[PDB]
Every structure is written in C-alpha cells, then in structure tokens.
C-alpha cells in the first residue's frame, strides 16, 4: 500500500491511458492507409491537386495580329 503511493501509477492509469494512445494510433494508421489510397488514384488520373505536372501557359496573347 505504501509502494502503491508515490511509486506506482495504478490500475486506473494505463487502462484509461494506452487506449488514448491507441485512439491516436488508429487515426494515424487509417489516414496513412488513406494517403496510400489517395496517391494511388491521384498519380494515375489527374483529378486532384496532388502529383500534378505543370502546364505550358494560362494566358499568353489574345490581341489582333497582322495574320492572313
């Protein structure tokens, strides 16, 4: 009982805790698997703003020339 105080965390700790660490771990694992799933799609088809190659130009010239 003396060893339980100021030397031990207790059974309440690491049961309420660790599950909190697992809750962050579950979020870290699912989003990393989602990142592997998103990059597998975004690289194959140019749909989103990920792995997009730069284009030539947006605007260059529109004025009237001396063309035929």
């Amino acid at each position: 009982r003396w060893i339980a105080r100021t030397f031990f965390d207790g059974p309440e700790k690491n049961y309420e805790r660790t599950m909190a660490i697992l809750q962050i771990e579950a979020e870290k694992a699912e989003l990393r698997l989602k990142e592997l799933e998103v990059r597998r799609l975004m690289r194959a088809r140019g749909d989103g703003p990920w792995f997009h190659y730069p284009t030539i130009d947006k605007e260059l010239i529109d004025h009237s020339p001396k063309a035929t």
């Binding site: 979020e27 989003l31 990393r32 140019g46 749909d47 989103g48 703003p49």
Partner: protein
C-alpha cells in the same frame, strides 16, 4: 475625285457594318474539361506528421 490625306489612316472604325455576328466559335470545337476544384477554407493540423514517428 480629288482627295489626298497628309496624315494617314490611323485605324478607322466601321459602325455601319452588320453582315454576320462576330461570336460564332471561329476555331473552337470542345469547351475543354473542367479543371481541379479549388480548395476553399483554412487548413487545420489534425494528424501532426504522418511519418514513422511523432
């Protein structure tokens, strides 16, 4: 018949002209597919590094 300009033409406008309407797609056939939708809203830190650690 005698009329001589001592300056030039300097781009004259034809307001009386009608004939055919100007916008009628001179060369364009396809409208080109819509670009990637712009993400609106401020980014928030949620995962805080999806690397091997932290």
């Amino acid at each position: 018949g005698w009329v001589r300009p001592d300056l030039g033409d300097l781009s004259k406008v034809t307001k009386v002209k009608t004939d055919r309407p100007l916008p009628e797609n001179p060369y364009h056939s396809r409208a080109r597919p819509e670009p990637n939708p712009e993400v609106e809203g401020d980014l928030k830190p949620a995962r805080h590094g999806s690397r091997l650690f932290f």
